[model samples]
Target: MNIFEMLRIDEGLRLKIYKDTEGYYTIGIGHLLTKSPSLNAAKSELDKAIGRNTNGVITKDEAEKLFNQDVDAAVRGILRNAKLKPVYDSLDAVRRAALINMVFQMGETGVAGFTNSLRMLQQKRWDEAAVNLAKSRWYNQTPNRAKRVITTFRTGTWDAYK
Candidate 1:
């Protein structure tokens, strides 16, 4: 079977500041800091092995596969089970997906720094979470991108793109 059919495989950018098994910085189909101290030094080698980023951009197939791999790890290994249980139970898919994407973009530790946002989410306070997210440094740093994700949180729907 084409595994993408069997997965929630939403293709998005890799890197997104993800993490690794050995608790080191990593991204895109296991691309990691294996070569030199600089991620630039390892980019060529990592991209070569992943069969993506040929033109300095990952293909849709590569994005789906890598996103599936990373999201699985972020859920199973990174997120604290107890801390996020309320989110998993209460949030609709759109909101949940945005939160997970935030985790992917900012790593677990980085997202955890959003104490008010996380607390509101845990309390099933959707509007408050959206407010907190909007007032965050993450939102300030990326207004264009944060607009959609914040909308998703605010509406509990994925139609923010429309």
Candidate 2:
């Protein structure tokens, strides 16, 4: 499946503000409002996207706009990374989506921290890559999503989306 569809399923969606697993104030398909430059800026952006004073809620269309922006930023971050660029370029679309999914959940720097796992992925050592991924706190934190991503890495299929 495409990155948009895959992420929509994985991240889920909420039009109203809610705390994420880590208790960050988030909204709109895992958009971490707390990560924005400032709370006021975040609220302002939300208002602009929805074309009104949101009063702490958003429409699906506005959420989709935010999701698109987030996805684009994630992709750009992955592409701009010195270490991830070549490895990312080597993968097919399905596997690329898996990588981008990781970047979406944890920024490019976070994904870059998986040195051994990234090596395994670059070398096409699917099982080893999966093993390395499973050995992380991320796996423990989000087992189901991690499992699906790890499965995608191993199998190079969109079965997770299916």
Candidate 3:
């Protein structure tokens, strides 16, 4: 499956705004409006996506558009990092998806902070990379998702997608 489909399952499709697990205002497939460049910009984007002034709601197609945009941003953010680009390029598609998934949740800067894990991934040290990723606050906060991503990294398979 593509990264979009993978993220749709992991992030879930939400039509209305609600508080995420971290209590941030979110909508439309984990789009964090509260963490947007600005709340006004976020609202405007939501309005544009829904094709009207939002009533805290979005359509499936609208959500898909936002999801695509968010995924593109995540991919760009990952590639824009000088240190991450080479490591990302060295990975297989499944492993690449796992890294993208991590970036989707944590942002590129957050993922970039995993120096040891990135180094291990660069060296193709699968188990070591997984172990290092597991030993993080992100893993503790989102164990199931983190475990799936970590396992994908370790095995370089689409088992997590299934």
Candidate 4:
């Protein structure tokens, strides 16, 4: 079954396809982060996984091959389809990756909703870029996530991205 088949995706489910470690893809969340298959599956091997907190379900080894392929492709698609390239061309890779992850967290339209942030990024206003990024529903929920990405941008370390 496809990832959608496995999940309870009803009308208007907006899944972001992402690349996995092995370079294949599954589906993930630009909306619901924790429950997303692409990201949840990445935590560890199924056997080693603890139960997931979001839906209280644990992953399994039932379809390891398909899972790996699905997750990777999903991740890659999210990155490739994002607006990161446009902004990153004028900015640093570290900054680009930070924005990419946030964009990944927030769907394209969600990120696009950041009018001031997008403008600041386009203008290469790094400080204002961070400030703009912190103002939204995404900002309300995922501060740890946003901070990690920003720290990477500020420090020029790939650790945050990885």
In angstroms, the error of model 1 at 59 is: 5.5
- How far in Å is the alpha carbon of 3 misplaced in model 4? 22
Candidate 2: where are CA atoms >4 Å away? 35-45, 48-51
Per-residue alpha-carbon lDDT of candidate 4 for residues 1-162, written as tens digits (9 for 90 to 100): 222322212112323434433243333322221333554464333223323332322323323433444445444644565454455466665555555554444455566566677667778676777776666656566566566655655565655444
Backbone clashes in model 3, listed as residue pairs: none
- Report lDDT (CA) for all predictions: 0.60, 0.89, 0.86, 0.47
Q: Residue 22: error of model 2 in Å?
A: 0.5
User: What TM-score would every model get versus the actual structure?
Assistant: 0.64, 0.91, 0.91, 0.47
Off by over 4 Å in 1: 1-40, 44-60, 78-81
State which candidate, 2 or 3, has the greater lDDT. 2
Judged by whole-model lDDT over C-alpha atoms, candidate 4 comes out at 0.47
lDDT of 1 at 3: 20
Best by lDDT: 2
- Model 3 lDDT-worst window of ten: 34-43
TM-score of 3: 0.91
Model 3 residue 155 CA deviation in Å: 0.5
**How do the candidates rank by TM-score, highest first?**
2, 3, 1, 4
What is the per-residue lDDT of model 2 for residues 1-162, given as tens digits with 9 covering 90 to 100?
Answer: 699999999999998877788877788998887755465766776676667999789889888999999999999998999989888998988999999999999999999999999999999999999998999999999999999999999999988768
lDDT of 1 at 134: 88
Question: In model 3, how large is the Cα lDDT of residue 119?
Answer: 95
26-111: candidate 3 lDDT, tens digit per residue? 88898887755455666776676567998788888888888889999999998899978988999999889989998998888898
lDDT of 2 at 59: 86
